Write a protein that binds this ligand. Structure first.
Ligand SMILES: *[C@@H]1O[C@H](CO[C@@H]2O[C@@H](C)[C@@H](O)[C@@H](O)[C@@H]2O)[C@@H](O[C@@H]2O[C@H](CO)[C@@H](O[C@@H]3O[C@H](CO[C@H]4O[C@H](CO)[C@@H](O)[C@H](O)[C@@H]4O[C@@H]4O[C@H](CO)[C@@H](O)[C@H](O)[C@H]4NC(C)=O)[C@@H](O)[C@H](O[C@H]4O[C@H](CO)[C@@H](O)[C@H](O)[C@@H]4O[C@@H]4O[C@H](CO)[C@@H](O)[C@H](O)[C@H]4NC(C)=O)[C@@H]3O)[C@H](O)[C@H]2NC(C)=O)[C@H](O)[C@H]1NC(C)=O
Ligand SMILES: *[C@@H]1O[C@H](CO[C@@H]2O[C@@H](C)[C@@H](O)[C@@H](O)[C@@H]2O)[C@@H](O[C@@H]2O[C@H](CO)[C@@H](O[C@@H]3O[C@H](CO[C@H]4O[C@H](CO)[C@@H](O)[C@H](O)[C@@H]4O[C@@H]4O[C@H](CO)[C@@H](O)[C@H](O)[C@H]4NC(C)=O)[C@@H](O)[C@H](O[C@H]4O[C@H](CO)[C@@H](O)[C@H](O)[C@@H]4O[C@@H]4O[C@H](CO)[C@@H](O)[C@H](O)[C@H]4NC(C)=O)[C@@H]3O)[C@H](O)[C@H]2NC(C)=O)[C@H](O)[C@H]1NC(C)=O
Lengths: 208, 205
């Protein structure tokens, strides 16, 4: 029979004003004989009608995939509003309902430390600057780097890792030429998370 | 029926004394008396040492052939082919696996002391940076005073623009114990290391 999967918005979409956080309801394994899927969307139990439904697409596996996308309000998602996808189809005994929301757990603020390159790393031609982001909940977060008050690309960030606390940590790091580290330039680790004041903290780092 | 083919653990691959196992998993087989046949090959030659794990079905029926692989063959990236025959299939389904291709690059291992501000609290993070390795198959562990340390976490490998991989491993310890000059070590096993092993240590300065 049809299976239903309900996906949350991307972390960055929830945390950045200029972005569009979406909940996505995906229906798979829809037969040729019972191809119609009906969607009903609810927000804390109230039905809404502005969800955008895509037309069915036959997959290489000879089954249909149907998708409905509901745009979520930033503040609603962060206040724990529940989003319910209801799927109706005639190869089903009864409608399938799935509900998604922000993570239930008590929110915890990240702690953010900056770490200079290893002393042993100081022999090489390029150097790593490290940002440690610790003890946050939930795992939605975004990290960015800056130099000279201007955005810096070419950083990498690990996924959140479940820690024994129940909280999360991650590392982000920037690789720079050695000269640029030791001409005293300042670098910055920026973190956006729902539990920070103004959902933002910045911590910086420079040659000592 | 769907076929999934899985690689061995890094340590089993890197230690002479251990048995690296590749796993062929067939799921979604009918309890209409469909019975399954296996053909394993290695670079085109078929093999008969595969050893079927008994069954156990769970509610809603999966058969599993476990193939012990040669250490050097795996490190050379030989392709392990699980071929599955079943009537509820058009023709055999074949799945192929192998060490990631490409010349191996060793990690450069660095240890990093806790942040100055983290020294304001009761526990501290000791950090191990593992950089520029290929492929991503790796193992990391922590030691203190000649003994295993199990209160660490390790991030997944992350792909850098290099094509190589990076990770961090974090050990959490009481501040008090760090400030007694204790020594801690990050040990890393990877195929491009000499003896597939390196250790790096770190203690209060
Ligand atoms: C026929 O085809 C369709 C389509 O497949 C496509 O075409 C076929 C022909 C092939 O070519 C495929 O290669 C190709 O994908 C098949 O449909 C697939 O069906 C399976 C289930 O049978 C679905 O699996 C679910 O996948 C989700 C994760 O899926 C995300 O990640 C996949 C990346 O690997 C990606 O493919 C998916 O599209 C999806 O990607 C996300 O998409 C959203 C919206 O588009 C986007 O916002 C995201 O950013 C994007 N993410 C990424 C990374 O790109 C997985 O979570 C599901 O597992 C849950 O459920 C399992 C139960 O089945 C359970 O065991 C798991 O543990 C997990 O459980 C859930 O998760 C946690 C922990 O359990 C918990 O919080 C939840 O409560 C729990 N919920 C449960 C258990 O229900 C599951 O793996 C595929 O998504 C689906 N593919 C697509 C594209 O829809 C179809 O099956 C084919 N064949 C047949 C015979 O039907
Ligand atoms: C009936 O029930 C069975 C039973 O299922 C299990 O138990 C039941 C009771 C429920 O709890 C289930 O939710 C639970 O799964 C159902 O069988 C399941 O079927 C699905 C799909 O049919 C399979 O999902 C795939 O699984 C692999 C990962 O599996 C490992 O990780 C699992 C986490 O869920 C975990 O179960 C195990 O760890 C498992 O096994 C590894 O096993 C080896 C052998 O012992 C062991 O050494 C390892 O340690 C162990 N792993 C770990 C971490 O320990 C996952 O890879 C699949 O995703 C791949 O496939 C997707 C579909 O192809 C694809 O979209 C993904 O991207 C990915 O595919 C690879 O990636 C690309 C994309 O880049 C893709 O296009 C390619 O095809 C593919 N290859 C490459 C090179 O890229 C997916 O999650 C379940 O494994 C299977 N359950 C079991 C136990 O096998 C069954 O579905 C039910 N029947 C029906 C009709 O629904």
């Amino acid at each position: 029979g049809p299976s239903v999967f309900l996906f949350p918005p991307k972390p960055k979409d929830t945390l950045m004003i200029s972005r569009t956080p979406e909940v996505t309801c995906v229906v798979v394994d829809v037969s040729h004989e019972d191809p119609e899927v009906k969607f009903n969307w609810y927000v804390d139990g109230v039905e809404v009608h502005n969800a955008k439904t895509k037309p069915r697409e036959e997959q290489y596996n000879s089954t249909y995939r149907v998708v409905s996308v509901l745009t979520v309000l930033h503040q609603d998602w962060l206040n724990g509003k529940e989003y319910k996808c209801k799927v109706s189809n005639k190869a089903l005994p009864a409608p399938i309902e799935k509900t998604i929301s922000k993570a239930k757990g008590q929110p915890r603020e990240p702690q953010v430390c900056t770490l200079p390159p290893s002393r042993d790393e100081l022999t090489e031609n390029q150097v790593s600057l490290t940002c440690l982001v610790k003890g946050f909940y939930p795992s939605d977060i975004a990290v960015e780097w800056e130099s000279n008050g201007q955005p810096e690309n070419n950083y990498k960030t690990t996924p959140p890792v479940l820690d024994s606390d129940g909280s999360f940590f991650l590392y982000s790091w920037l690789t720079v030429d050695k000269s640029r580290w030791q001409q005293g330039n300042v670098f910055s680790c920026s973190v956006m998370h729902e539990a920070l004041h103004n959902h933002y903290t910045q911590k910086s780092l420079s040659l000592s």
